[PDB]
Design a binder for this molecule. Sequence first.
Ligand SMILES: NC(=[NH2+])NCCC[C@H](N)C(=O)O
Ligand SMILES: [Mg+2]
Ligand SMILES: [Mg+2]
Ligand SMILES: [Mg+2]
Ligand SMILES: [Mg+2]
Ligand SMILES: [Mg+2]
Ligand SMILES: [Mg+2]
Ligand SMILES: [Mg+2]
Ligand SMILES: [Mg+2]
Ligand SMILES: [Mg+2]
Ligand SMILES: [Mg+2]
Ligand SMILES: [Mg+2]
Ligand SMILES: [Mg+2]
Ligand SMILES: [Mg+2]
Ligand SMILES: [Mg+2]
Ligand SMILES: [Mg+2]
Ligand SMILES: [Mg+2]
Ligand SMILES: [Mg+2]
Ligand SMILES: [Mg+2]
Ligand SMILES: [Mg+2]
Ligand SMILES: [Mg+2]
Ligand SMILES: [Mg+2]
Ligand SMILES: [Mg+2]
Ligand SMILES: [Mg+2]
Ligand SMILES: [Mg+2]
Ligand SMILES: [Mg+2]
Ligand SMILES: [Mg+2]
Ligand SMILES: [Mg+2]
Ligand SMILES: [Mg+2]
Ligand SMILES: [Mg+2]
Ligand SMILES: [Mg+2]
Ligand SMILES: [Mg+2]
Ligand SMILES: [Mg+2]
Ligand SMILES: [Mg+2]
Ligand SMILES: [Mg+2]
Ligand SMILES: [Mg+2]
Ligand SMILES: [Mg+2]
Ligand SMILES: [Mg+2]
Ligand SMILES: [Mg+2]
Ligand SMILES: [Mg+2]
Ligand SMILES: [Mg+2]
Ligand SMILES: [Mg+2]
Ligand SMILES: [Mg+2]
Ligand SMILES: [Mg+2]
Ligand SMILES: [Mg+2]
Ligand SMILES: [Mg+2]
Ligand SMILES: [Mg+2]
Ligand SMILES: [Mg+2]
Ligand SMILES: [Mg+2]
Ligand SMILES: [Mg+2]
Ligand SMILES: [Mg+2]
Ligand SMILES: [Mg+2]
Ligand SMILES: [Mg+2]
Ligand SMILES: [Mg+2]
Ligand SMILES: [Mg+2]
Ligand SMILES: [Mg+2]
Ligand SMILES: [Mg+2]
Ligand SMILES: [Mg+2]
Ligand SMILES: [Mg+2]
Ligand SMILES: [Mg+2]
Ligand SMILES: [Mg+2]
Ligand SMILES: [Mg+2]
Ligand SMILES: [Mg+2]
Ligand SMILES: [Mg+2]
Ligand SMILES: [Mg+2]
Ligand SMILES: [Mg+2]
Ligand SMILES: [Mg+2]
Ligand SMILES: [Mg+2]
Ligand SMILES: [Mg+2]
Ligand SMILES: [Mg+2]
Ligand SMILES: [Mg+2]
Ligand SMILES: [Mg+2]
Ligand SMILES: [Mg+2]
Ligand SMILES: [Mg+2]
Ligand SMILES: [Mg+2]
Ligand SMILES: [Mg+2]
Ligand SMILES: [Mg+2]
Ligand SMILES: [Mg+2]
Ligand SMILES: [Mg+2]
Ligand SMILES: [Mg+2]
Ligand SMILES: [Mg+2]
Ligand SMILES: [Mg+2]
Ligand SMILES: [Mg+2]
Ligand SMILES: [Mg+2]
Ligand SMILES: [Mg+2]
Ligand SMILES: [Mg+2]
Ligand SMILES: [Mg+2]
Ligand SMILES: [Mg+2]
Ligand SMILES: [Mg+2]
Ligand SMILES: [Mg+2]
Ligand SMILES: [Mg+2]
Ligand SMILES: [Mg+2]
Ligand SMILES: [Mg+2]
Ligand SMILES: [Mg+2]
Ligand SMILES: [Mg+2]
Ligand SMILES: [Mg+2]
Ligand SMILES: [Mg+2]
Ligand SMILES: [Mg+2]
Ligand SMILES: [Mg+2]
Ligand SMILES: [Mg+2]
Ligand SMILES: [Mg+2]
Ligand SMILES: [Mg+2]
Ligand SMILES: [Mg+2]
Ligand SMILES: [Mg+2]
Ligand SMILES: [Mg+2]
Ligand SMILES: [Mg+2]
Ligand SMILES: [Mg+2]
Ligand SMILES: [Mg+2]
Ligand SMILES: [Mg+2]
Ligand SMILES: [Mg+2]
Ligand SMILES: [Mg+2]
Ligand SMILES: [Mg+2]
Ligand SMILES: [Mg+2]
Ligand SMILES: [Mg+2]
Ligand SMILES: [Mg+2]
Ligand SMILES: [Mg+2]
Ligand SMILES: [Mg+2]
Ligand SMILES: [Mg+2]
Ligand SMILES: [Mg+2]
Ligand SMILES: [Mg+2]
Ligand SMILES: [Mg+2]
Ligand SMILES: [Mg+2]
Ligand SMILES: [Mg+2]
Ligand SMILES: [Mg+2]
Ligand SMILES: [Mg+2]
Ligand SMILES: [Mg+2]
Ligand SMILES: [Mg+2]
Ligand SMILES: [Mg+2]
Ligand SMILES: [Mg+2]
Ligand SMILES: [Mg+2]
Ligand SMILES: [Mg+2]
Ligand SMILES: [Mg+2]
Ligand SMILES: [Mg+2]
Ligand SMILES: [Mg+2]
Ligand SMILES: [Mg+2]
Ligand SMILES: [Mg+2]
Ligand SMILES: [Mg+2]
Ligand SMILES: [Mg+2]
Ligand SMILES: [Mg+2]
Ligand SMILES: [Mg+2]
Ligand SMILES: [Mg+2]
Ligand SMILES: [Mg+2]
Ligand SMILES: [Mg+2]
Ligand SMILES: [Mg+2]
Ligand SMILES: [Mg+2]
Ligand SMILES: [Mg+2]
Ligand SMILES: [Mg+2]
Ligand SMILES: [Mg+2]
Ligand SMILES: [Mg+2]
Ligand SMILES: [Mg+2]
Ligand SMILES: [Mg+2]
Ligand SMILES: [Mg+2]
Ligand SMILES: [Mg+2]
Ligand SMILES: [Mg+2]
Ligand SMILES: [Mg+2]
Ligand SMILES: [Mg+2]
Ligand SMILES: [Mg+2]
Ligand SMILES: [Mg+2]
Ligand SMILES: [Mg+2]
Ligand SMILES: [Mg+2]
Ligand SMILES: [Mg+2]
Ligand SMILES: [Mg+2]
Ligand SMILES: [Mg+2]
Ligand SMILES: [Mg+2]
Ligand SMILES: [Mg+2]
Ligand SMILES: [Mg+2]
Ligand SMILES: [Mg+2]
Ligand SMILES: [Mg+2]
Ligand SMILES: [Mg+2]
Ligand SMILES: [Mg+2]
Ligand SMILES: [Mg+2]
Ligand SMILES: [Mg+2]
Ligand SMILES: [Mg+2]
Ligand SMILES: [Mg+2]
Ligand SMILES: [Mg+2]
Ligand SMILES: [Mg+2]
Ligand SMILES: [Mg+2]
Ligand SMILES: [Mg+2]
Ligand SMILES: [Mg+2]
Ligand SMILES: [Mg+2]
Ligand SMILES: [Mg+2]
Ligand SMILES: [Mg+2]
Ligand SMILES: [Mg+2]
Ligand SMILES: [Mg+2]
Ligand SMILES: [Mg+2]
Ligand SMILES: [Mg+2]
Ligand SMILES: [Mg+2]
Ligand SMILES: [Mg+2]
Ligand SMILES: [Mg+2]
Ligand SMILES: [Mg+2]
Ligand SMILES: [Mg+2]
Ligand SMILES: [Mg+2]
Ligand SMILES: [Mg+2]
Ligand SMILES: [Mg+2]
Ligand SMILES: [Mg+2]
Ligand SMILES: [Mg+2]
Ligand SMILES: [Mg+2]
Ligand SMILES: [Mg+2]
Ligand SMILES: [Mg+2]
Ligand SMILES: [Mg+2]
Ligand SMILES: [Mg+2]
Ligand SMILES: [Mg+2]
Ligand SMILES: [Mg+2]
Ligand SMILES: [Mg+2]
Ligand SMILES: [Mg+2]
Ligand SMILES: [Mg+2]
Ligand SMILES: [Mg+2]
Ligand SMILES: [Mg+2]
Ligand SMILES: [Mg+2]
Ligand SMILES: [Mg+2]
Ligand SMILES: [Mg+2]
Ligand SMILES: [Mg+2]
Ligand SMILES: [Mg+2]
Ligand SMILES: [Mg+2]
Ligand SMILES: [Mg+2]
Ligand SMILES: [Mg+2]
Ligand SMILES: [Mg+2]
Lengths: 83, 141, 203, 59, 110
Amino acid sequence: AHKKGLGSTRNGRDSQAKRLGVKRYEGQVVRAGNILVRQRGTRFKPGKNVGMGRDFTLFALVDGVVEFQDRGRLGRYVHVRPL
Amino acid sequence: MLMPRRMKYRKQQRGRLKGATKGGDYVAFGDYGLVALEPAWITAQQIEAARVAMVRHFRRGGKIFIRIFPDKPYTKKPLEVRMGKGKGNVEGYVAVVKPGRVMFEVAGVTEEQAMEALRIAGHKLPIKTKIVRRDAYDEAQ
Amino acid sequence: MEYRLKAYYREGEKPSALRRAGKLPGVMYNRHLNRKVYVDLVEFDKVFRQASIHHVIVLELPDGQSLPTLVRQVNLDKRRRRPEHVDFFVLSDEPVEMYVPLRFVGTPAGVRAGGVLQEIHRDILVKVSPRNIPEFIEVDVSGLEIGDSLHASDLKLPPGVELAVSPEETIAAVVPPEDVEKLAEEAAAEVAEPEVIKKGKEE
Amino acid sequence: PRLKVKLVKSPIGYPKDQKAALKALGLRRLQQERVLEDTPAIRGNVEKVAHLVRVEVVE
Amino acid sequence: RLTAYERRKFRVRNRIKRTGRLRLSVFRSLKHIYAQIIDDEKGVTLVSASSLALKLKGNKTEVARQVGRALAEKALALGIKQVAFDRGPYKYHGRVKALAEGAREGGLEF
RNA sequence: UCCCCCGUGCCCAUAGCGGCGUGGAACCACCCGUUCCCAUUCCGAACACGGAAGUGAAACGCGCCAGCGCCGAUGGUACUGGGCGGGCGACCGCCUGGGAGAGUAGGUCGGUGCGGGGGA
RNA sequence: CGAUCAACGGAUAAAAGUUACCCCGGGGAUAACAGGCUGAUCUCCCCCGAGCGUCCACAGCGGCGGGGAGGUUUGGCACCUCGAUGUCGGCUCGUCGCAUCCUGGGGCUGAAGAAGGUCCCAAGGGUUGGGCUGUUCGCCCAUUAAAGCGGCACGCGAGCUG
RNA sequence: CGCCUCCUAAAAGGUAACGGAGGCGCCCAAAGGUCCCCUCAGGCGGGACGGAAAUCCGCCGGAGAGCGCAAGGGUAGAAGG
RNA sequence: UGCGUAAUAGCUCACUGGUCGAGUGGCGCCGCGCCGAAAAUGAUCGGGGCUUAAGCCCAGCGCCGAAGCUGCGGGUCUGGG
RNA sequence: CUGACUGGGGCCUGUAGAGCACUGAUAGGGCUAGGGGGCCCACCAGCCUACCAAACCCUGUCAAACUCCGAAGGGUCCCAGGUGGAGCCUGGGAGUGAGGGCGCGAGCGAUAACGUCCGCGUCCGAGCGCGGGAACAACCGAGACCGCCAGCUAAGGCCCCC
Ligand SMILES: NC(=[NH2+])NCCC[C@H](N)C(=O)O
Ligand SMILES: [Mg+2]
Ligand SMILES: [Mg+2]
Ligand SMILES: [Mg+2]
Ligand SMILES: [Mg+2]
Ligand SMILES: [Mg+2]
Ligand SMILES: [Mg+2]
Ligand SMILES: [Mg+2]
Ligand SMILES: [Mg+2]
Ligand SMILES: [Mg+2]
Ligand SMILES: [Mg+2]
Ligand SMILES: [Mg+2]
Ligand SMILES: [Mg+2]
Ligand SMILES: [Mg+2]
Ligand SMILES: [Mg+2]
Ligand SMILES: [Mg+2]
Ligand SMILES: [Mg+2]
Ligand SMILES: [Mg+2]
Ligand SMILES: [Mg+2]
Ligand SMILES: [Mg+2]
Ligand SMILES: [Mg+2]
Ligand SMILES: [Mg+2]
Ligand SMILES: [Mg+2]
Ligand SMILES: [Mg+2]
Ligand SMILES: [Mg+2]
Ligand SMILES: [Mg+2]
Ligand SMILES: [Mg+2]
Ligand SMILES: [Mg+2]
Ligand SMILES: [Mg+2]
Ligand SMILES: [Mg+2]
Ligand SMILES: [Mg+2]
Ligand SMILES: [Mg+2]
Ligand SMILES: [Mg+2]
Ligand SMILES: [Mg+2]
Ligand SMILES: [Mg+2]
Ligand SMILES: [Mg+2]
Ligand SMILES: [Mg+2]
Ligand SMILES: [Mg+2]
Ligand SMILES: [Mg+2]
Ligand SMILES: [Mg+2]
Ligand SMILES: [Mg+2]
Ligand SMILES: [Mg+2]
Ligand SMILES: [Mg+2]
Ligand SMILES: [Mg+2]
Ligand SMILES: [Mg+2]
Ligand SMILES: [Mg+2]
Ligand SMILES: [Mg+2]
Ligand SMILES: [Mg+2]
Ligand SMILES: [Mg+2]
Ligand SMILES: [Mg+2]
Ligand SMILES: [Mg+2]
Ligand SMILES: [Mg+2]
Ligand SMILES: [Mg+2]
Ligand SMILES: [Mg+2]
Ligand SMILES: [Mg+2]
Ligand SMILES: [Mg+2]
Ligand SMILES: [Mg+2]
Ligand SMILES: [Mg+2]
Ligand SMILES: [Mg+2]
Ligand SMILES: [Mg+2]
Ligand SMILES: [Mg+2]
Ligand SMILES: [Mg+2]
Ligand SMILES: [Mg+2]
Ligand SMILES: [Mg+2]
Ligand SMILES: [Mg+2]
Ligand SMILES: [Mg+2]
Ligand SMILES: [Mg+2]
Ligand SMILES: [Mg+2]
Ligand SMILES: [Mg+2]
Ligand SMILES: [Mg+2]
Ligand SMILES: [Mg+2]
Ligand SMILES: [Mg+2]
Ligand SMILES: [Mg+2]
Ligand SMILES: [Mg+2]
Ligand SMILES: [Mg+2]
Ligand SMILES: [Mg+2]
Ligand SMILES: [Mg+2]
Ligand SMILES: [Mg+2]
Ligand SMILES: [Mg+2]
Ligand SMILES: [Mg+2]
Ligand SMILES: [Mg+2]
Ligand SMILES: [Mg+2]
Ligand SMILES: [Mg+2]
Ligand SMILES: [Mg+2]
Ligand SMILES: [Mg+2]
Ligand SMILES: [Mg+2]
Ligand SMILES: [Mg+2]
Ligand SMILES: [Mg+2]
Ligand SMILES: [Mg+2]
Ligand SMILES: [Mg+2]
Ligand SMILES: [Mg+2]
Ligand SMILES: [Mg+2]
Ligand SMILES: [Mg+2]
Ligand SMILES: [Mg+2]
Ligand SMILES: [Mg+2]
Ligand SMILES: [Mg+2]
Ligand SMILES: [Mg+2]
Ligand SMILES: [Mg+2]
Ligand SMILES: [Mg+2]
Ligand SMILES: [Mg+2]
Ligand SMILES: [Mg+2]
Ligand SMILES: [Mg+2]
Ligand SMILES: [Mg+2]
Ligand SMILES: [Mg+2]
Ligand SMILES: [Mg+2]
Ligand SMILES: [Mg+2]
Ligand SMILES: [Mg+2]
Ligand SMILES: [Mg+2]
Ligand SMILES: [Mg+2]
Ligand SMILES: [Mg+2]
Ligand SMILES: [Mg+2]
Ligand SMILES: [Mg+2]
Ligand SMILES: [Mg+2]
Ligand SMILES: [Mg+2]
Ligand SMILES: [Mg+2]
Ligand SMILES: [Mg+2]
Ligand SMILES: [Mg+2]
Ligand SMILES: [Mg+2]
Ligand SMILES: [Mg+2]
Ligand SMILES: [Mg+2]
Ligand SMILES: [Mg+2]
Ligand SMILES: [Mg+2]
Ligand SMILES: [Mg+2]
Ligand SMILES: [Mg+2]
Ligand SMILES: [Mg+2]
Ligand SMILES: [Mg+2]
Ligand SMILES: [Mg+2]
Ligand SMILES: [Mg+2]
Ligand SMILES: [Mg+2]
Ligand SMILES: [Mg+2]
Ligand SMILES: [Mg+2]
Ligand SMILES: [Mg+2]
Ligand SMILES: [Mg+2]
Ligand SMILES: [Mg+2]
Ligand SMILES: [Mg+2]
Ligand SMILES: [Mg+2]
Ligand SMILES: [Mg+2]
Ligand SMILES: [Mg+2]
Ligand SMILES: [Mg+2]
Ligand SMILES: [Mg+2]
Ligand SMILES: [Mg+2]
Ligand SMILES: [Mg+2]
Ligand SMILES: [Mg+2]
Ligand SMILES: [Mg+2]
Ligand SMILES: [Mg+2]
Ligand SMILES: [Mg+2]
Ligand SMILES: [Mg+2]
Ligand SMILES: [Mg+2]
Ligand SMILES: [Mg+2]
Ligand SMILES: [Mg+2]
Ligand SMILES: [Mg+2]
Ligand SMILES: [Mg+2]
Ligand SMILES: [Mg+2]
Ligand SMILES: [Mg+2]
Ligand SMILES: [Mg+2]
Ligand SMILES: [Mg+2]
Ligand SMILES: [Mg+2]
Ligand SMILES: [Mg+2]
Ligand SMILES: [Mg+2]
Ligand SMILES: [Mg+2]
Ligand SMILES: [Mg+2]
Ligand SMILES: [Mg+2]
Ligand SMILES: [Mg+2]
Ligand SMILES: [Mg+2]
Ligand SMILES: [Mg+2]
Ligand SMILES: [Mg+2]
Ligand SMILES: [Mg+2]
Ligand SMILES: [Mg+2]
Ligand SMILES: [Mg+2]
Ligand SMILES: [Mg+2]
Ligand SMILES: [Mg+2]
Ligand SMILES: [Mg+2]
Ligand SMILES: [Mg+2]
Ligand SMILES: [Mg+2]
Ligand SMILES: [Mg+2]
Ligand SMILES: [Mg+2]
Ligand SMILES: [Mg+2]
Ligand SMILES: [Mg+2]
Ligand SMILES: [Mg+2]
Ligand SMILES: [Mg+2]
Ligand SMILES: [Mg+2]
Ligand SMILES: [Mg+2]
Ligand SMILES: [Mg+2]
Ligand SMILES: [Mg+2]
Ligand SMILES: [Mg+2]
Ligand SMILES: [Mg+2]
Ligand SMILES: [Mg+2]
Ligand SMILES: [Mg+2]
Ligand SMILES: [Mg+2]
Ligand SMILES: [Mg+2]
Ligand SMILES: [Mg+2]
Ligand SMILES: [Mg+2]
Ligand SMILES: [Mg+2]
Ligand SMILES: [Mg+2]
Ligand SMILES: [Mg+2]
Ligand SMILES: [Mg+2]
Ligand SMILES: [Mg+2]
Ligand SMILES: [Mg+2]
Ligand SMILES: [Mg+2]
Ligand SMILES: [Mg+2]
Ligand SMILES: [Mg+2]
Ligand SMILES: [Mg+2]
Ligand SMILES: [Mg+2]
Ligand SMILES: [Mg+2]
Ligand SMILES: [Mg+2]
Ligand SMILES: [Mg+2]
Ligand SMILES: [Mg+2]
Ligand SMILES: [Mg+2]
Ligand SMILES: [Mg+2]
Ligand SMILES: [Mg+2]
Ligand SMILES: [Mg+2]
Ligand SMILES: [Mg+2]
Ligand SMILES: [Mg+2]
Ligand SMILES: [Mg+2]
Ligand SMILES: [Mg+2]
Ligand SMILES: [Mg+2]
Ligand SMILES: [Mg+2]
């Protein structure tokens, strides 16, 4: 019977989710190498005993305890307090 | 009739209609107002019929303030098509209106003139309405 | 004039209980005091519709005290268009910012020509002594045509009262009226379709 | 003191975490009564299922 | 609006304090030169030396060098050895450089 | 331990903008030079060196002022975890716990650690 | 190092159509009929009263807009039925709804009379014969008080036609 | 039809529809490493040819510029020159 | 002010005089109802039938009511004796 | 003894709401480049505008792909309660990979569908066993080991059917 023609959608695309965010929260015991934050750019900055990778990934340089610090206009920092 | 001159996006999701009006709940300009008593998408056609009805009752004189604007695109699929194949086409524009919103205000006109013009205007809208007069409460806002 | 209003003290009563008993909840404050009050709604409404942040309201309290206040803020229930809470600002001896009613004297020549006087500001914000509060401020608008305007820089202020807004702020204007003769112009006025802001490689 | 907790309304149809709260209190049949110590951790589960339960202070 | 001076200083010193060493900060006025060895974890100065405090002679470059030796001698008697040089807003050159060379002659390790 | 200054941190504008005033003994700066080190896509402006006649004009430091900026309650409301009702619906209420944002009152022309020089 | 193995976890090194001559296994997991849910569309009824009607908003009309009802249209959905629920139109036989075509009773009229217009009540009965076309419908001829519209699986193929 | 960005996504992560919008299948021998130096867009005023916009000067101007290319995050106390 | 004439005239509203002798006219909000309300086999709130209810709103006391809970007896498994 | 769940403590978050500081939208007024038009002019300027109107300002608003703000909650770690047909490790055996209704949060649809597609929860599925809802998988009540001519209640009821 009378079925009308249709168009289509120029959309339908999206990329895979990237599983970003903080991975260890303040007060968690971590080992050297433990990734602490996954992020685009420096939403968090590396503090004491924390390195940063080429993709802004924050990881622990020593065994210890994660600590967060908000320094106002200077940004938010992730530290690792040695045990 | 009213619609945005430009926009960032052609089509908007539908959203909800919960709650009292966000702002625009007090008489801000004229002497009398027409307040929405229930929520709705008010169409640009409805606003223009409401405006013309007040202009025609005034003949010459007075001032109408339209305090809602239809910026929300209204979408409808072409007739006799099935579900799917993308979002419908924009057929018109609506203003979201929630209870307590002052949609129109009038000034420069007698009380009897305003009462009657706001009444005829209210008959063109898909919702119940109230006529109000500027108050000290309005002024203290 | 000088209005009076009985006020009462409240500690942990719930606002919805007070409002269900016909009482408007409120607060009293200045740099020295802050007290939770309530007034009677029908009593407050009788006074406020006249006094209205413009004129002084004296609060008679149950401890015998009486305090001269300005209504500083009225919170309205947006659904029902009803006051739900009042702020009473207890006046001291220093000056105070406040709104003094504007009073437009005379009929504009524009209004005679068919125009409409748009009272943009119906009061004006001002620093004045709480022993100096004028009833109003007259403004002659009889020389305004369509479309002239008046600003706060044209306010002839009484003595003791200093303007607390920018002198460039518009207070009144006389605008053209609604005209049915314009309708057919606006009806047969085609307005082109909305443009959508270019996104991506085309901008 | 202690809490006497009586299950008086069935958890059928209620979210599973409320069913777990009853298991943490040891309440498994209707009209069952348990006398539990009054600590903040036991009290948090009693309050969680307060709409199912009848409480009394005892001892 | 930061100045080129303040930007140069922040930039040089952030990089220094990243390495976690005690910093040898150097302030060079038109007349005098000054040095502090600073623990940035405690925000605390450990040993000082300057021309003004040693009431030192004429030629600013040799004065700077003697300031460095003086700082070294007092530093070692406290156990300090390794350090990071903080030229701050100045080029590594002349007076600052002399003070650094003078610190190294005295056994400060950097 | 108190006051001034010079370094250098911390809190992250209650610390800022603007206006006004103030300081050169000391310190700092401008300053005096461009031989020497070093330097300018040109320029001793900057960077750098050697100085010491002058000036606190610029900068900096220290006061005062609330026009701006920044901060900002109390009260009440929105919203809501959990618990219940109502409406054919769009949606609307009650209980208990939590509770903004805007705005009002008001606050602010910074506070503090360490070392160094000077002063009493 | 050689991949638009881009159908991008990439069947072969190497591949297109057609079937109304079709066949088997399955599915009401999925379409066409009919029902159902829905009611956009459809049909009908209202609200507002701009403006028409010489005069006069409302005899008769009703700009722009607003609210419903029905479930006869075209669809949406895919819920019973694909181990079968025969599908248009006609004939025959009815029966029901009423939003009434006629006949009966009314109000208003821009109702002199006669004849109309419009709305209200009313479903008892009645509602013709032909030309065309498969037609339903529609147009036309000749009449008529009138030549109503819909539902019943677009009523009725274990009743006929085809 | 694989991949990237945003939204839908209900403040962890994840989350569908033939839902709403865009991009990729490259590039760079510097557009890479390090050291040193430098700071934007924009507004106003001034300046031959010279203009809305070329280059010059002054004041204001915390980031609205820039970062090869979509979008987002990030960023001058540099990732920009 | 309404009704009328092409206009006219009119009767009249607003209006003021007298009689009468105490209330009258106009908004607005709340509870419960009225109309708006037409569809196809025979109707109906489940039926009968119900009106200071056997309806609706507020406040109570008692009872009825399941294979839920208790009492009594039994089985089986698990845990402890 | 590590579990679901719960107490306290820390950290992470950008939704509800709100807001307009950014990106856009936006009504009116003010101020004001640029145009339209009007006197005056070509000799290059000048005045006037109830015209359209950028920027800016005021008042008042809008936003999934806006955010100067921003909850309730949610997540995760630590310590504590929690002995449960809890949890963890290794290995044997599967079945399932057509879901469905309802509540709430959205998208799609038409602020349609016993519609459709996700999220949190629930029940049916497998509790078409039991009471209530006239009847009725998923609404209310409640998790049926067996027996009793015993008692108390739940939702719902207590004029008669009952
Ligand atoms: N935590 C709460 N009480 N939430 C209530 C949510 C709002 C609710 N629907 C009401 O209006 O009553
Ligand atoms: Mg069909
Ligand atoms: Mg179709
Ligand atoms: Mg396409
Ligand atoms: Mg898409
Ligand atoms: Mg793809
Ligand atoms: Mg993914
Ligand atoms: Mg996805
Ligand atoms: Mg993604
Ligand atoms: Mg995170
Ligand atoms: Mg690296
Ligand atoms: Mg890199
Ligand atoms: Mg901390
Ligand atoms: Mg630390
Ligand atoms: Mg939607
Ligand atoms: Mg609509
Ligand atoms: Mg739509
Ligand atoms: Mg679609
Ligand atoms: Mg659509
Ligand atoms: Mg429309
Ligand atoms: Mg609204
Ligand atoms: Mg209406
Ligand atoms: Mg406001
Ligand atoms: Mg009132
Ligand atoms: Mg591009
Ligand atoms: Mg229950
Ligand atoms: Mg149970
Ligand atoms: Mg239940
Ligand atoms: Mg729960
Ligand atoms: Mg939970
Ligand atoms: Mg039980
Ligand atoms: Mg109880
Ligand atoms: Mg200092
Ligand atoms: Mg410190
Ligand atoms: Mg000033
Ligand atoms: Mg100064
Ligand atoms: Mg001096
Ligand atoms: Mg001197
Ligand atoms: Mg030379
Ligand atoms: Mg020489
Ligand atoms: Mg020089
Ligand atoms: Mg120099
Ligand atoms: Mg000299
Ligand atoms: Mg000076
Ligand atoms: Mg001076
Ligand atoms: Mg300096
Ligand atoms: Mg002060
Ligand atoms: Mg803050
Ligand atoms: Mg605030
Ligand atoms: Mg509060
Ligand atoms: Mg809730
Ligand atoms: Mg609903
Ligand atoms: Mg609450
Ligand atoms: Mg509370
Ligand atoms: Mg909030
Ligand atoms: Mg606040
Ligand atoms: Mg300040
Ligand atoms: Mg300091
Ligand atoms: Mg000191
Ligand atoms: Mg000292
Ligand atoms: Mg492609
Ligand atoms: Mg494939
Ligand atoms: Mg292939
Ligand atoms: Mg690929
Ligand atoms: Mg894949
Ligand atoms: Mg292969
Ligand atoms: Mg192959
Ligand atoms: Mg081969
Ligand atoms: Mg092939
Ligand atoms: Mg073949
Ligand atoms: Mg053939
Ligand atoms: Mg064929
Ligand atoms: Mg053939
Ligand atoms: Mg054949
Ligand atoms: Mg054959
Ligand atoms: Mg053949
Ligand atoms: Mg064959
Ligand atoms: Mg077959
Ligand atoms: Mg087969
Ligand atoms: Mg078969
Ligand atoms: Mg399938
Ligand atoms: Mg089908
Ligand atoms: Mg079909
Ligand atoms: Mg079919
Ligand atoms: Mg059929
Ligand atoms: Mg069908
Ligand atoms: Mg059937
Ligand atoms: Mg239906
Ligand atoms: Mg309908
Ligand atoms: Mg319907
Ligand atoms: Mg329709
Ligand atoms: Mg109707
Ligand atoms: Mg009418
Ligand atoms: Mg006419
Ligand atoms: Mg007439
Ligand atoms: Mg007319
Ligand atoms: Mg009519
Ligand atoms: Mg119409
Ligand atoms: Mg409609
Ligand atoms: Mg309709
Ligand atoms: Mg039907
Ligand atoms: Mg049908
Ligand atoms: Mg129906
Ligand atoms: Mg269909
Ligand atoms: Mg159909
Ligand atoms: Mg279909
Ligand atoms: Mg089916
Ligand atoms: Mg389905
Ligand atoms: Mg079939
Ligand atoms: Mg068979
Ligand atoms: Mg069969
Ligand atoms: Mg058969
Ligand atoms: Mg029939
Ligand atoms: Mg009838
Ligand atoms: Mg008839
Ligand atoms: Mg008749
Ligand atoms: Mg006649
Ligand atoms: Mg007749
Ligand atoms: Mg008739
Ligand atoms: Mg009638
Ligand atoms: Mg009949
Ligand atoms: Mg009959
Ligand atoms: Mg008939
Ligand atoms: Mg015929
Ligand atoms: Mg024939
Ligand atoms: Mg013939
Ligand atoms: Mg025939
Ligand atoms: Mg025919
Ligand atoms: Mg035909
Ligand atoms: Mg024809
Ligand atoms: Mg005849
Ligand atoms: Mg007849
Ligand atoms: Mg039929
Ligand atoms: Mg049909
Ligand atoms: Mg059909
Ligand atoms: Mg049939
Ligand atoms: Mg038929
Ligand atoms: Mg048949
Ligand atoms: Mg047959
Ligand atoms: Mg047949
Ligand atoms: Mg048959
Ligand atoms: Mg048959
Ligand atoms: Mg038969
Ligand atoms: Mg045949
Ligand atoms: Mg034959
Ligand atoms: Mg997401
Ligand atoms: Mg998201
Ligand atoms: Mg998320
Ligand atoms: Mg994960
Ligand atoms: Mg597709
Ligand atoms: Mg593409
Ligand atoms: Mg290069
Ligand atoms: Mg510039
Ligand atoms: Mg210029
Ligand atoms: Mg020129
Ligand atoms: Mg230029
Ligand atoms: Mg940028
Ligand atoms: Mg009715
Ligand atoms: Mg009674
Ligand atoms: Mg029983
Ligand atoms: Mg049992
Ligand atoms: Mg026995
Ligand atoms: Mg037993
Ligand atoms: Mg047993
Ligand atoms: Mg067992
Ligand atoms: Mg344990
Ligand atoms: Mg654990
Ligand atoms: Mg917990
Ligand atoms: Mg929102
Ligand atoms: Mg904005
Ligand atoms: Mg604002
Ligand atoms: Mg919204
Ligand atoms: Mg919003
Ligand atoms: Mg969003
Ligand atoms: Mg948002
Ligand atoms: Mg603010
Ligand atoms: Mg804040
Ligand atoms: Mg939280
Ligand atoms: Mg979430
Ligand atoms: Mg938590
Ligand atoms: Mg969890
Ligand atoms: Mg926590
Ligand atoms: Mg434990
Ligand atoms: Mg189990
Ligand atoms: Mg298990
Ligand atoms: Mg086996
Ligand atoms: Mg399997
Ligand atoms: Mg399977
Ligand atoms: Mg499968
Ligand atoms: Mg599946
Ligand atoms: Mg399926
Ligand atoms: Mg599903
Ligand atoms: Mg499931
Ligand atoms: Mg069902
Ligand atoms: Mg649902
Ligand atoms: Mg509900
Ligand atoms: Mg939904
Ligand atoms: Mg969605
Ligand atoms: Mg609708
Ligand atoms: Mg479904
Ligand atoms: Mg649904
Ligand atoms: Mg839905
Ligand atoms: Mg489900
Ligand atoms: Mg199954
Ligand atoms: Mg069940
Ligand atoms: Mg189950
Ligand atoms: Mg069964
Ligand atoms: Mg049964
Ligand atoms: Mg049942
Ligand atoms: Mg039943
Ligand atoms: Mg029954
Ligand atoms: Mg059942
Ligand atoms: Mg059992
Ligand atoms: Mg009993
Ligand atoms: Mg009961
Ligand atoms: Mg009954
Ligand atoms: Mg009985």
